[PDB]
Amino acid sequence: QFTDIDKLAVSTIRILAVDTVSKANSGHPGAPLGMAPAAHVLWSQMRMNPTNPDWINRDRFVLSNGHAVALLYSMLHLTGYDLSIEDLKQFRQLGSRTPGHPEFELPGVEVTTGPLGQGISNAVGMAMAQANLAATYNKPGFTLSDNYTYVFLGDGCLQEGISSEASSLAGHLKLGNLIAIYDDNKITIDGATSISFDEDVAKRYEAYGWEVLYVENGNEDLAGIAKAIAQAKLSKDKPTLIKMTTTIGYGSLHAGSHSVHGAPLKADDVKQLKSKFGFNPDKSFVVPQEVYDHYQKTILKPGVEANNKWNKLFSEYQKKFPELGAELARRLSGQLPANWESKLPTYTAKDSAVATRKLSETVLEDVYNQLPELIGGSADLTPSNLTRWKEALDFQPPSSGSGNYSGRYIRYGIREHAMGAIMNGISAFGANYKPYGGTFLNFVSYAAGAVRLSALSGHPVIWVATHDSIGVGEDGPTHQPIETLAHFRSLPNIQVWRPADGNEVSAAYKNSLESKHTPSIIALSRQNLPQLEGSSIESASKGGYVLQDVANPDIILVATGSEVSLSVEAAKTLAAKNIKARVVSLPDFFTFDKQPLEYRLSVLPDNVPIMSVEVLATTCWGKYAHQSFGIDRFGASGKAPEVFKFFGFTPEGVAERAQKTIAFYKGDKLISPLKKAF
Amino acid sequence: QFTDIDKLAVSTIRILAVDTVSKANSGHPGAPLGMAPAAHVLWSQMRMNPTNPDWINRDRFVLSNGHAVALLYSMLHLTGYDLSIEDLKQFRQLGSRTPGHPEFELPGVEVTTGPLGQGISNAVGMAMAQANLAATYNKPGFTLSDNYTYVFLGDGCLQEGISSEASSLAGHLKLGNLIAIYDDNKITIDGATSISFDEDVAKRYEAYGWEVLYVENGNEDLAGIAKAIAQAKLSKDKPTLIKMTTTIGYGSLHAGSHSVHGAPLKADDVKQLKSKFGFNPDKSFVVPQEVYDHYQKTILKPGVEANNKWNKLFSEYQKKFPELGAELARRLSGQLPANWESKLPTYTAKDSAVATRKLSETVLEDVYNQLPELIGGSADLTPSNLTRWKEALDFQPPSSGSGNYSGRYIRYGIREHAMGAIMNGISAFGANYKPYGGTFLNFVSYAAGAVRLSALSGHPVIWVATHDSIGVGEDGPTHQPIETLAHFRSLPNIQVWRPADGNEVSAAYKNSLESKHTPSIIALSRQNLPQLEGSSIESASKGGYVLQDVANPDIILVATGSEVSLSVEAAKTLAAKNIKARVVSLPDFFTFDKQPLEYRLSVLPDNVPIMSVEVLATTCWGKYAHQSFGIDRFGASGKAPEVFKFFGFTPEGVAERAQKTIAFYKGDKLISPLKKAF
Ligand SMILES: Cc1ncc(C[n+]2csc(CCOP(=O)(O)OP(=O)(O)O)c2C)c(N)n1
Ligand SMILES: Cc1ncc(C[n+]2csc(CCOP(=O)(O)OP(=O)(O)O)c2C)c(N)n1
Ligand SMILES: [Ca+2]
Ligand SMILES: [Ca+2]
């Protein structure tokens, strides 16, 4: 049941969204106008506290078609969130709380969206984290976790391959609290969908195991829209897609056209719209009092009460289940277990040569039980990534017989881009969830649209990226990374760890898991690497450090990963012809760059030749080294020692390029690459 | 009608494949064993000349599941292509002709595959290029083009989102000559597909508009497989997926296990397998004379005859039709029209300030008419990219009414990753097709998977990448590139053009269209830019050049795109203070690096501080500059001129950092960043 006030609230939403876009003279009015009825019906029945946007058991809303952002900012204002009319008047302007696409950082905005296909795939991750939280902490009489995940989406999201991968996994996992509403308005930027998008969507979604419901009149059928949503709540075992037909830019003089997609409405058009809906055409950013009163009564006071009952329940739960209640209280505060890092493995020079992939396996097996918030996964490369702890139970529907929702190991299938946006979703859910995902380093590049949002939003997800170089060997250039780490070291706000040995792998895991706002790629080797004399977790935690020192060196060798042991053999060959080399291990550029300049210049000082050593692209190394020995062409298919050799990466090959660097600069005064002038 | 020689042929393929893998002691034996029946039936019925792998009307085969390579190498050898037993005996070894995943360079290998989902999406483009050549050149009595495009694919390919984008578009365009055979074997690397992949594949492909056919026993039912391929060739207006159930590693002691996916069979398993098939278990790389004789009569001599007929009909064609005959003859020779570049727009300082994206649009208007082989499109950004020429016909099915198959503008929809692979498949088809695709620069990263294979194989595809920087303005950080060019400049064999004005846009299109082995990204501005005094097609074609010279410069300013004009302005500001600045324009790192070292040192000499100016990451500039002014953080939502002012990119803002640079180095001797020690 809906009344006259509900229709006044739908008109107030539509005109607020239109006035926001028109003052900015930039933005997208069309999908805001077609989806306002659904937004009113959905938010009115969501359990949420506007006053406490972090309540762990709030229902979650994701706007996947992020260009429709004027609608999400109109709803957040009208329902009581911290977003005022003056912020809406600053839409798309420099420095405002209202950017052109929603950002994770704003209260009530769940994830950053706007790149198409990301929001629906993040919503699949949020629904998985809910299903895991519920299966881990709910007890008879204590339903602490039972929220819904709701998603709005458009034609562009359904054409993106990423939202196919996420929807196929979501259907397999039978995530029944995930309810997606598709704005089926037959329009994208180039015009009618008929021109390149006429697949049967409803049929594709039933193939994935989703339930598909239909709303023929999304423009005005409030009871049908409400019907459709509570029927979706009944199907516990299936995710649900509600295909809802609307007119893009409903109410506009050019309603139904692609011209209303992504440009402000004409002033004369805005005036007849306002007149039509019973509003004064000469006034702007007008909210009727009855509307503020209505959302106070139906959303905000019920939501504040719901959150208060949930808090009473949780403090009873902590009395009843002291261990589980202390664990979830610690997680809800963002804190890792005190002294958790005492459990990280440390090594010495006498321990054996191990590939850093197997060393990473050992860290996940030694800390999994210390950290209940750690949830892992592989994009079908579990045996090659060594991401699986053996006591692990898989994250699966309970009816499968392979695991249940309390499991902490996810089988992502061969879906790297949805694995990245799903890990962003699990992270964004809350409760200190620490998602990691595995794949070969070369195919993290398949997930670049999502990894970029991990860095922009600040979601601290971990990519466990194995098979980091030509050390892959025989699979050849299609599988051997060359450009990949130069790519992600150019991306702001991401750690790119390329650990050299066991102590450096524990350092990489310590910093990655302690991060609250920075994602991490941990690049790992196929081949065996020795345990280095001079490495430690303390040192390697600084991002870069002096591994092997010597007084008054002729050169500094800076290396990463498998090339650190090579540079150390190279300096032995150099010592024998009386050249003194300092060897510097640089396991992460990000973390090194964050150290104070005094520390960084003690690692890479003035007046010494510095040569970098790394079997990948040399394009990023001008910030740390004068000369660079790397590989700026594709790899080669053959046995890994033979391929290293072919590229010149032997102790004598490295020592010879160092002897050439010393000769080239002999008698010149050198300045550390670190020193900037501005 | 198969006989005992077809069973001996299928056994020799299985065993030659197992031996190829077992001698390397590396590789994937499972799917070559399961798909050998279907490869025998398909290749026996394909029209191809093995002594001319370039015949334009040859039927094409793509192995999308690239790790099954030993099956392809086997077939090429047996049917008389240029690949010997000796080559197979060097599989996965350094320097061999048989690398561990198939490469475009080998005759008979149509594209490089291995990265999953690529091959099936390339095959879509090969089908589109065929439907356009047939429609442009076939005349009554002269059917010059009519080939089929055959695809083998596996489960991994079906999980990747790129094959959903490509399969959706393929159904829309009604590509009836595309026939794909799905190896339905129930296993992927992590075990059984039920663990993460239980969707209804058939029902999903019928929703895209494809026909689905089934072969329940692919292990042995040759007639059934031949009956599916024959019925699929009747599919004239629907692509066809043949779901063929097989057992992974059929014949092995561990057939149906994922342990047989990506490791050699144990030596005694290979023995029993040889005995089971009627082969001596102590001999290897054995091809029965009967199998060679048979392929010579079924494939090779009929293919030579089919090519020879096709040759005489093309001679008749050129006489009946001299105009189209001459054009098709020039395209098959792979040459661009005599002196086509004369139609490229040139400009002077006196002309208007134009966005570089709209200069791009004018070039495509002046050339689509000169170049029949130019086929373009956009990933639903046609109005924002100005990629559609006014007189263009869209590439659509005739039934659509919206255009037809001789049309040369493709509506790809929001499918960037598939647009990249489809462009690779159109280029790989031959006949000098020059594909280009438009999207925003920030979302070319959605397509990184395919862009890397354009560079690795050398497909000269062109990306018209608009909205190159914070000059996007109001859409904000989710749409503003920062790291994107640093990434593709770190990738070997790809041109990344960032033109500053009218003449540099023309030079970017002439080098990109003349290119035979190197892809290109052209980054273009949303905002208006001045026509530069001193720019020319001839100088910008060198990749970097002196735009503004002075004798005895205090500083060199190196810049690209929108920051070249800013740099000219800052140089007027520095001139006022008695500082003399040479301005260098560097529209492409790749083309500039190809110039002779003495030309590069003339542009960037020793003894002068060199400062780079570009509103994107600074990390790749150390190969050219001493110091760099750029943005190493994400963008901001606001009007574009206010955002440029916010980051310091003002004439006097560049001038001030130029003065600090002069100050910091005054007194030091400076080496060109171009000079290397080894
Ligand atoms: C990955 C990606 N590619 C391209 C764009 C640019 N873009 C923004 S909206 C849009 C299509 C509009 O799609 P739709 O969801 O149908 O719009 P609506 O009906 O919501 O107006 C495009 C191509 C994008 N934001 N992200
Ligand atoms: C994009 C990409 N991601 C990951 C891999 C690693 N990989 C190779 S085969 C495969 C899984 C097995 O796929 P399937 O097609 O089911 O194999 P088959 O049944 O043919 O053995 C994976 C994950 C890859 N080659 N490309
Ligand atoms: Ca739409
Ligand atoms: Ca399979």
| Domains of chain B listed by start with CATH number | 1-329 (3.40.50.970), 330-541 (3.40.50.970), 542-678 (3.40.50.920)
Find chain B residues with C-beta within 8 A of A115's C-beta: 442-443, 446, 478-479
Find chain B residues with C-beta within 8 A of A474's C-beta: 24, 26-27, 92-93, 100
> Nearest-CA distance from B21 to chain A in Å?
11
* Interface subset of B 477-506, CB within 8 angstroms of A: 477-479, 482-483, 486-493
Decide if A416 is catalytic: yes
As for chain A, the residues directly before each break of C–N over 2.5 Å are: none
Beta bridge partners of B131: none
Find chain A residues with C-beta within 8 A of B457's C-beta: none
Q: Are B101 and B67 in contact (CB under 8 A)?
A: yes
Of the candidates B491, A337, A172, which has an alpha carbon nearest to the alpha carbon of residue A164? A172
Q: Is A115 in the pocket of ligand 1 (CB under 6 A)?
A: yes
Residue type, B262: G
Of the candidates A645, A474, A442, which has an alpha carbon nearest to the alpha carbon of residue B98? A474
Q: What is the SS3 assignment for B518?
A: coil
Residue type, B357: R
Of the candidates B415, B637, B160, B384, which has an alpha carbon nearest to the alpha carbon of residue A117? B415
Q: Is A575 in the pocket of ligand 2 (CB under 6 A)?
A: no
Q: Are A498 and A561 in contact (CB under 8 A)?
A: yes
Could you tell me if A475 lies within 8 Å of chain B, comparing CB atoms? Answer: yes
Residue B260 Cα to ligand 4 midpoint, Å, equals 11
Q: Is A31 in the pocket of ligand 1 (CB under 6 A)?
A: yes
* Pair of tokens at residue B130: 């065929």
Positions of B marked catalytic = 416
Q: Are B454 and B489 in contact (CB under 8 A)?
A: no
Cβ of B161 within 8 Å of Cβ of A161? The answer is: yes
| CA B91/CA B93 separation, integer angstroms | 6
Numbers of helices and strands, H then E, in chain B: 25, 20
Number of neighbours of residue A351 by Cβ within 10 angstroms: 14
Give the nearest ligand 1 atom to A185 CA.
19
| CA B419/CA A506 separation, integer angstroms | 41
* Interface subset of A 36-75, CB within 8 angstroms of B: 66
Q: Which residue is catalytic, options A211, A361, A416, A563?
A: A416
For residue A636, give the nearest of B94, B200, B661 by CB distance.
B94
Place of tokens 């001079």: A534
Cβ of B100 within 8 Å of Cβ of A190? The answer is: no
Could you tell me if B200 lies within 8 Å of chain A, comparing CB atoms? Answer: yes
For residue B114, give the nearest of A378, A478, A673 by CB distance.
A478
DSSP A588: B
DSSP B202: H
Q: Are A125 and A429 in contact (CB under 8 A)?
A: yes
Whole-Å CA distances, A303 to A45, A53, A57, A109: 10, 11, 11, 17
Could you tell me if B411 lies within 8 Å of chain A, comparing CB atoms? Answer: yes
For residue A637, give the nearest of B92, B486, B677 by CB distance.
B92
Return contacts of B108-112, CB within 8 angstroms, 24+ apart: B108/B50, B108/B53, B108/B72, B108/B76, B108/B81, B108/B82, B108/B83, B109/B72, B109/B76, B110/B60, B110/B61, B110/B62, B110/B428, B111/B62, B111/B424, B111/B425, B111/B428, B111/B453, B111/B457, B112/A478, B112/B66, B112/B453, B112/B456, B112/B457
Beta strands in A257-389 (DSSP E): 374-378
Count of CB pairs separated by less than 8 Å, A with B: 357
> Nearest-CA distance from B350 to chain A in Å?
32
Of the candidates B53, B72, B77, which has an alpha carbon nearest to the alpha carbon of residue B62? B72
Could you tell me if A549 lies within 8 Å of chain B, comparing CB atoms? Answer: no
Could you tell me if A446 lies within 8 Å of chain B, comparing CB atoms? Answer: yes
Residue B156 Cα to ligand 4 midpoint, Å, equals 7
Of the candidates B218, B141, B179, B199, which has an alpha carbon nearest to the alpha carbon of residue B62? B179
Residue type, B670: L
DSSP A198: -
Environment class of B317 (CB within 10 Å of its CB; exposed 0-12, middle 13-18, buried 19+): buried
* Interface subset of B 84-143, CB within 8 angstroms of A: 92-96, 99-101, 112-116
Of the candidates B356, B337, B331, which has an alpha carbon nearest to the alpha carbon of residue B345? B356
Residue B586 half-sphere exposure, CB side, CA atoms within 13 Å? Answer: 25
Cβ of A161 within 8 Å of Cβ of B164? The answer is: yes
Which distant-in-sequence residues (6+ apart) come within 8 Å of B628 by Cβ?
B611, B612, B614, B618, B621, B622
Of the candidates A408, A453, A458, which has an alpha carbon nearest to the alpha carbon of residue A435? A408
| CA A120/CA B104 separation, integer angstroms | 36
Beta bridge partners of A214: A243
- Length of chain B as a residue count: 678
Q: Are B260 and B249 in contact (CB under 8 A)?
A: yes
Environment class of B140 (CB within 10 Å of its CB; exposed 0-12, middle 13-18, buried 19+): exposed
Nearest-5° angle of CA A138, CA A143, CA A149?
A: 95
* Pair of tokens at residue B188: 């992927």
Of the candidates B242, B260, B261, B243, which has an alpha carbon nearest to the alpha carbon of residue B252? B260
Nearest-5° angle of CA A641, CA A647, CA A653?
A: 90
Could you tell me if B448 lies within 8 Å of chain A, comparing CB atoms? Answer: yes
Could you tell me if A606 lies within 8 Å of chain B, comparing CB atoms? Answer: no
Q: Name the residue of chain B whose CA is nearest to A207's CA.
A: B200
Q: Are A148 and A175 in contact (CB under 8 A)?
A: no
Cβ of B190 within 8 Å of Cβ of A620? The answer is: no
| CA A618/CA B196 separation, integer angstroms | 38
Find chain B residues with C-beta within 8 A of A206's C-beta: 200, 203
Cβ of A490 within 8 Å of Cβ of B620? The answer is: yes
Residue B484 half-sphere exposure, CB side, CA atoms within 13 Å? Answer: 32
From the centroid of its chain, how far is CA A21? 28
| CA B82/CA B89 separation, integer angstroms | 15
| CA A526/CA B213 separation, integer angstroms | 41
* Interface subset of B 278-337, CB within 8 angstroms of A: none
| CA A642/CA A471 separation, integer angstroms | 10
Beta strands in B379-481 (DSSP E): 409-411, 434-440, 462-466
Sign of CA dihedral B275, B279, B280, B285: negative
- Could you write out the three-class secondary structure of B255-308? CCCHHHCCCCCCHHHHHHHHHHCCCCCCCCCCCCHHHHHHHHHHHHHHHHHHHH
The experimental method behind these coordinates is: X-ray
Report which protein residue has its CA nearest ligand 2's atom 12. B188
DSSP B413: -
* Pair of tokens at residue A215: 């709303």
Which distant-in-sequence residues (6+ apart) come within 8 Å of B569 by Cβ?
B651, B654
Q: Is A27 in the pocket of ligand 1 (CB under 6 A)?
A: no
Q: Is B325 in the pocket of ligand 2 (CB under 6 A)?
A: no
Compute φ and ψ for A439, nearest 5 degrees. Answer: -165, 175
H-helix segments, A333-395: 356-367, 382-385
Cα distance between the two ends of chain B: 64
Residue type, B475: D
Place of tokens 């009115």: A44
Phi-psi region of A565 (alpha: psi -120 to 50; beta: other; left: phi over 0): alpha
Report which protein residue has its CA nearest ligand 2's atom 26. B115
Cβ of B101 within 8 Å of Cβ of A663? The answer is: no
Number of neighbours of residue B111 by Cβ within 10 angstroms: 28
Q: Is A529 in the pocket of ligand 1 (CB under 6 A)?
A: no
Of the candidates B424, B554, B328, B437, which has an alpha carbon nearest to the alpha carbon of residue B125? B424
Q: Are A113 and A56 in contact (CB under 8 A)?
A: no
For residue A483, give the nearest of B189, B490, B627 by CB distance.
B490
Q: Name the residue of chain A whose CA is nearest to B664's CA.
A: A677
Beta bridge partners of A63: A152
| CA B10/CA B7 separation, integer angstroms | 5
* Pair of tokens at residue B627: 């110091």
Could you tell me if B398 lies within 8 Å of chain A, comparing CB atoms? Answer: no
Q: Is A403 in the pocket of ligand 1 (CB under 6 A)?
A: no
Q: Is B163 in the pocket of ligand 2 (CB under 6 A)?
A: no
Cβ of B627 within 8 Å of Cβ of A196? The answer is: no
For residue A196, give the nearest of B96, B172, B619 by CB distance.
B172
Whole-Å CA distances, B153 to A153, A175, B38, B121, B157: 31, 29, 12, 11, 6
Report which protein residue has its CA nearest ligand 2's atom 25. B115
Crossing angle of helices A118-137 and A448-457, in 10° steps, is 70
Cβ of B622 within 8 Å of Cβ of A623? The answer is: yes
